Amino acid sequence: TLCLGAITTLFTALCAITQNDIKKIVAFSTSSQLGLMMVTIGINQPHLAFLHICMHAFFKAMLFMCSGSIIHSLNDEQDIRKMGGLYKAMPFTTTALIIGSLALTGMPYLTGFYSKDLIIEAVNMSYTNAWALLMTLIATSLTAAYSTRIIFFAFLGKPRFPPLVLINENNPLLINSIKRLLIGSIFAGFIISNNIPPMTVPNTTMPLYMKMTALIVTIM
Amino acid sequence: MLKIIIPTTMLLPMTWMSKHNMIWINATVHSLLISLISLSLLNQLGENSLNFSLTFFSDSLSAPLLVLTTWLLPLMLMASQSHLSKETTTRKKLYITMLILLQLFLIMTFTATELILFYILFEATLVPTLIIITRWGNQTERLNAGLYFLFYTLAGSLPLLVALVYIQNTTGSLNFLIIHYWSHPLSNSWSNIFMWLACIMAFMVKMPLYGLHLWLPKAHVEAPIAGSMVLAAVLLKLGGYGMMRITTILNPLTNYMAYPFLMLSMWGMIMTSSICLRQTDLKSLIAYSSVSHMALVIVAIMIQTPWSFMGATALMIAHGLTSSMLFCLANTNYERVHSRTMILARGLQTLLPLMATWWLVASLTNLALPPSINLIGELFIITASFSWSNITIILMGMNMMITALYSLYMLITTQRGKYTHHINNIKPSFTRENALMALHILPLLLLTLNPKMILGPLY
Amino acid sequence: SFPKYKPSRLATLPATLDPAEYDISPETRKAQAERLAIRSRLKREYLLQYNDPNRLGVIEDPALIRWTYARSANIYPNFRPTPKTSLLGALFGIGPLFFWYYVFKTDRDKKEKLIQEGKLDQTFNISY
Amino acid sequence: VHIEPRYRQFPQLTRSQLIQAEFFSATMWFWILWRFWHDSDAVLGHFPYPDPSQWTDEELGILPDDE
Amino acid sequence: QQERDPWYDWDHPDLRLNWGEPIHWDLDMYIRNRVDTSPTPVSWNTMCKHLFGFVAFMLFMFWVGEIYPSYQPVGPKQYPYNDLYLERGGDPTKEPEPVVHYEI
Amino acid sequence: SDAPPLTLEAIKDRVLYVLKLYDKIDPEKLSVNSHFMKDLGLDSLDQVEIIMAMEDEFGFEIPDIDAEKLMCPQEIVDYIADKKDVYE
Amino acid sequence: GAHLARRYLGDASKEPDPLRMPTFPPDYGFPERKEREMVATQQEMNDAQLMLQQRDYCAHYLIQLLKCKRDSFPNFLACKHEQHDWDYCEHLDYVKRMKEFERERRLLQRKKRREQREAEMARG
Amino acid sequence: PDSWDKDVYPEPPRRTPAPAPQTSLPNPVTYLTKIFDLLVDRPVTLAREFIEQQHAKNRYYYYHREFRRVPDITECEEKDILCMFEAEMQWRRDYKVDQEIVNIIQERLKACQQREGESYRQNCAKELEQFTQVSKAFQDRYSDLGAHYSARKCLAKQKQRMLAERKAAKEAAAA
Amino acid sequence: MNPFASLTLTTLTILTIPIMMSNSNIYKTNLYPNYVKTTVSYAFTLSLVPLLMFMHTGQEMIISNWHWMTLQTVELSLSFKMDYFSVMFIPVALFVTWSIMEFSMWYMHSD
Amino acid sequence: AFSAPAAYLTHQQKVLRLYKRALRHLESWCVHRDKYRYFACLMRARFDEHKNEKDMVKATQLLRQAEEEFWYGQHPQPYIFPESPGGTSYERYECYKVPEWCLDDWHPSEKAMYPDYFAKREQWKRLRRESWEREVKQLQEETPPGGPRTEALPPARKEGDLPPLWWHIVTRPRERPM
Amino acid sequence: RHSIFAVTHVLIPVWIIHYYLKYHVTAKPYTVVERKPRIFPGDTILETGEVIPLMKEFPDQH
Ligand SMILES: CCCCCCCCCCCCCCCCC[C@@H](O)O[C@H](CO[C@H](O)CCCCCCCCCCCCCCC)COP(=O)(O)OCC[N+](C)(C)C
Ligand SMILES: CCCCCCCC/C=C/CCCCCCCC(=O)OC[C@H](COP(=O)(O)OCCN)OC(=O)CCCCCCC/C=C/CCCCCCCC
Ligand SMILES: CCCCCCCCCCCC(=O)SCCNC(=O)CCNC(=O)[C@H](O)C(C)(C)COP(=O)(O)O
Structure with missing residues (x-):
């Protein structure tokens, strides 16, 4: 199980970093997260895997909703090469996608932090396959890599879409659903992790460099 | 049990004494009443x-x-x-007489x-x-089919007669x-x-067993729709019951006499499931589906365990209903376009939505979706085979994939895609055909509700 | 100059990479003309019936009928018992059966020998 | 709310969406700063990791290579 | 059928077939819901080499990392009551040999 | 809702707008019925570039066999109208 | 890790083996050793239903933490002292495990070096 | 309730802890259970009271059917069809009853596993031992008879097992 | 009688009601998506209560309500496991589904 | 899609097609607009360098090297317009296209609604019926004795004629039918 | 007319479900099995009134 999860997450994170369709990028991200979940199960931490399921649902669903909003605005266009600068044209969508991308990369004290950070620090402290550990680290670097790809190609720079600009995200249904999932992706990790009984034995004594491994690799 | 036998023998002269335009109504009404009467046999000990x-x-297997x-x-009658419709009155009465005589013979066979x-x-x-096959079939192959249907049976059954009298x-x-009660073991000698x-x-050729099945595609393709219905849903189960x-x-000879037939059944189940993947004829695909399911039933009967017998009984009932529904669904399109090629009429979901729903339900049941009785029988047989030998889960598993493929293949070929442009004679579905589909499909899920x-009898 | 692309059965050669279409001669042009003429004649024959206001039903296509007949009924009359046909039939129809028989017989013999010695751990094995 | 196309100009923006986006970004950053101010140990670690080589042989009970 | 021109006015556009033209023996195998033989940007016998090399390298690396595992500089975890003998299946009528953990 | 119901006048305006941003044609000399080779003195490569610009502007592809035939802006507008089911 | 590099690239003869550890008697180097005690009764941990893996030597702090969590249900941020106590106990447990690991490594290397030296002395 | 015998389906004495509040904030669960009680449990109770009032005015009874014991298959002559038939039916009834006994034991085991929570490996050893004994006896009785089972085949299996045990005992006495 | 069971079963049961009205004169009108969305939101709000019960007391249950069929010794019944995983995942899935359905009302308007 | 194909493509046609494909794939490589314009101008100069070659053999040989270079340096994942034969919406609306003859089978209750539409439908059907004999005769007259050699169809020339075989082209379902 | 959704879609199903679980499902043994509540030191039992002793005089490594 651990080896299957490691190979799956590494391979899918490697495939995601060159895809031009945004839905393909998010699908490969989902596959890589499932591989990380399999890695968590392989090191005998089922409750951590379930917690990661619960925390991943929020930001993955709302990232897909943001991608769908972008697709609908630009006449059903899905290629990021024809998606220009939407940072100012789609303010709320940009905010939601940025928050979701930071949650997916385990930025501290967000929803993705409380599961992915513990998962990484737990695979760091276990009698496990060395290749699996290395592939997990490379995959959690590639995660930030493809999130950067999405943000940079879809929101920064100059427009590249057809000149008939029909961009409009002022619909209460879209705004309300995305805002609900945004509040979730901000606060659910804290709320849930502080309200469940401890079903693990925590790792309280780690070397400082290894405790910060996830942050370092994400930044690199 | 003459309370069931006599009303059919009364269906005979009622059909022959009916007014020229009231034969179908009387036959269908009284056949439905006879089915309601026969429903009382389900109360077993x-x-x-x-x-x-x-x-x-009457036993828990024959009821x-x-x-x-x-x-x-009645479903055949509809x-x-x-x-x-264009037939003369006398020939219509003769056709109904053939159907009634077949029902009477089957009723007496299942209770002798x-x-x-x-x-x-x-x-x-x-x-x-x-x-029925050689008189009311449509193409010139029917004659040959009849011969293939006849001698294949008789060459298997005439030796049995000898054995029977010998016993x-x-x-x-x-x-x-x-x-x-007076059963005794069979020794290991050439005579035994x-x-x-x-x-x-005889029962292995009526299943039919793989290698002995060549008569079945002919018989089920050149027959009229009622003939195909009765051949696939009931007449194949005579071999299993027998x-x-x-x-x-036959114990304990079966313990080692089943090896060639078990090998044939498993490998030919794989082979016929694969054959279904490349079939230009839509009726032949259903026929080979029947061959695969009956191969599974043969395995279940041959391994001789209570779970296998339970699964085999459930599989025979479910296959009968499902294959009859599939044949009727194919016959609707045939009557519309007068051709049996699968890739002729395409994209029919756009033109006939409710028919597409019927097709979807029939195909979902064919691939044994839970908790349908098809799945119950298949899973019981698979568990029994796993107990027999752990390696069987390979072959069985293979079949489970292939079936699904070809099943959805048929659907995707006939209902999805784009409609053929030059075919413009596709009229809306009649109430009769929709009622036929509903009366096929509702009992399946109703039995799913009460699977025992x-x-x-092994339950 | 650049690395060459070599075609396969499941990845065929592109048209623009085909040497045969880059050295042409007049008989090739004549052949293309007759090919287009045949295609256009068939297209006209189809379109005349396709647009007919009095046409109701299915336009019969002899190509489809020929294809289905060749795939179904023409096969046996054109069959000859040859060393290739006989060997392929014997292999593909006999080898799998004996292979599976050997595998299952070996497994069941091993299981029975384990049962006779009383060491298989059949505890809780009620249903069979 | 009616927003018309522009044809090579910046799209029309209503004040509500800008207010919502800025508010939610600000609340995210405030939450991060507040939680880090109150839960620094969750990121920087809570207990000092000891090094092993500065542990004496007396508490580790290893003999002076003689007996 | 995927290799046929998609911009042509086919009589059957989904099948990419014309009325009356010869069908081909394996048409149902090539219906473009199925086996595709279209040209690829990278040659066959080069895609296969890269895929097989990746898979074999990953397998051999996983085996190597199995026989050269990673761990932490700690002793085994200690549990009080004879390694929780009664908790993991009991058998309280056998008096298992005592396991003792000493302070350090 | 979705995009407004594109009209013939809008299509003609957009095509003329795109053509008047081309450096190789004179905006005053350009008319709806001006031929690309005859009146404007362009070659086949310029026509391919014009077709690609139209494809970029309207967001749908024109097949090469059909694109080879469009020689005046009116023909381009007509092809677009027949492609997108525009009748007013 | 550096211990991995020491074991896998350097001399693995003197490096501790995590699977087979400890390889010296617990009383070998120490004159006397105190028996490590437990505060939670077996019935107490059974009633708390902790886990088969949470019933370690720090189980009493976990039991107290769970009890305070249940008592202070709506205020899910009030049991920080108890969580800190449990974390400190587990930290001390991990420190003890590291101390055992180093004791074993030092014993291994000293024993093998002393055996080599004694063999050399007996070889001259 | 008194619907089932508490000896055949036993249960522990069900000790639960008392509410020991420590926080001044209200317990939302308490108000939720009070609301659920007053809004759902009381109308359902009134409806059930009406139904039982209607049932009490029409009291009729059904009885458990009793079967005598007839001679077994061991006391039947070789070709006496009537005695064979009666013994066979008695054997089938006993087989069904044994199946239901195994069912009861398995239900006990499953309930124990769910009830004991995280201590199930230690707190449900007795149910596991009872299931082991019952399963061993059932397997010795009825396994490998196969389809077309009968009392004669079960008797043959028992005689074969008896012969094997007797031979083992007689050869062990020789040691 | 321990509202845990009733609420856990009602959360699942009420989701099947629009499926039953799919044949009625609300599936043929334009108010069906809002009806389904409101049903899912109500289901999420109802399922929020067993989660609170578990977070307070750690309550877990299994409910074997319908006996489907019994083989010789194997008994098959309709049973639901309502432990921590189920009562934790149900509200999250319902919340996400409610958000996606509200999004779909806008995304698939022209379908 | 609308024009009848020819027996073969000319050299100029092949060169133009290769030019368009190279430009599109280079744009797929060069995401940004200014970089694309730079390299597209470079490609245009590269193309028009050999524009004036009087040797047809050398021209087709240069085209052969051009095709080889394009196949080596093509984009593995080129941009496709959403409704193009490789796009994400190529046949999305084909499930909503219903042929017009289906309306001939509507129940009279269904036809009770939309009376004027069905009146116009009757007028169109009558026009097609009247027109068919003439369309057939014109095709008979204009066809060479050795059968047609292309798939092109003649227009209408007579006073009130209609172009032959027009019904199924005029009555296309729609591009967004439902 | 306003809050009729909460009646026909929540109150009625919960009434039926509560009745079915209270008077039919729990009329048979082992149909609704609830795991044993956790008992902590210092607790008192509701039925027996038994109080649980405290926890072995913590070494107090404060
Ligand atoms: C197209 C599909 C149609 C259906 C196929 C039906 C399959 C029928 C196959 C019959 C199964 C087995 C038949 C006989 C049982 C054993 C077979 C034999 O090989 O086993 C050995 C037999 O030994 C030798 O093989 C002797 C037999 C050799 C002669 C038989 C001819 C085989 C040729 C195969 C031709 C294909 C037959 C099918 C024609 C259509 C066992 O040694 P032995 O202990 O001594 O015999 C046991 C009987 N005793 C106890 C009384 C002594
Ligand atoms: C028990 C072991 C079973 C493993 C499977 C063995 C091989 C199975 C081969 C199945 C053959 C079926 C043939 C007929 C199927 C219908 C035809 C068909 O599928 O068409 C192919 C269709 C078109 O391809 P696209 O890329 O989508 O094209 C889109 C652009 N045009 O795509 C498919 O469906 C192909 C799917 C076939 C998968 C075969 C490979 C699977 C092998 C799995 C082995 C690995 C096991 C996993 C180990 C996990 C670790 C424990
Ligand atoms: C992105 C990676 C792929 C890169 C691929 C591109 C690189 C290849 C570029 C170089 C290839 C060539 O120039 S190959 C040069 C081929 N030589 C000739 O064509 C000479 C004869 N001239 C004509 O045919 C016409 O004048 C014509 C030129 C068609 C103009 O057409 P019009 O005036 O009537 O519009």
């Missing part, structure tokens, strides 16, 4: 059978089959009145207490079927109850081996 008389008895036969007769009487009725079923000159009785083969080959009955006197009615 837990220890022995229902011994009505010295001649007839669902009798109910299925009496329920199938499915037949479309393409027989005597093996020679069972042989006589199980052989008498050939004449109405052969007449009666040794044990003194062919009554099933006495045969069961050939007696086993004579007792088994094997389940006759295996009580079709699990057989």
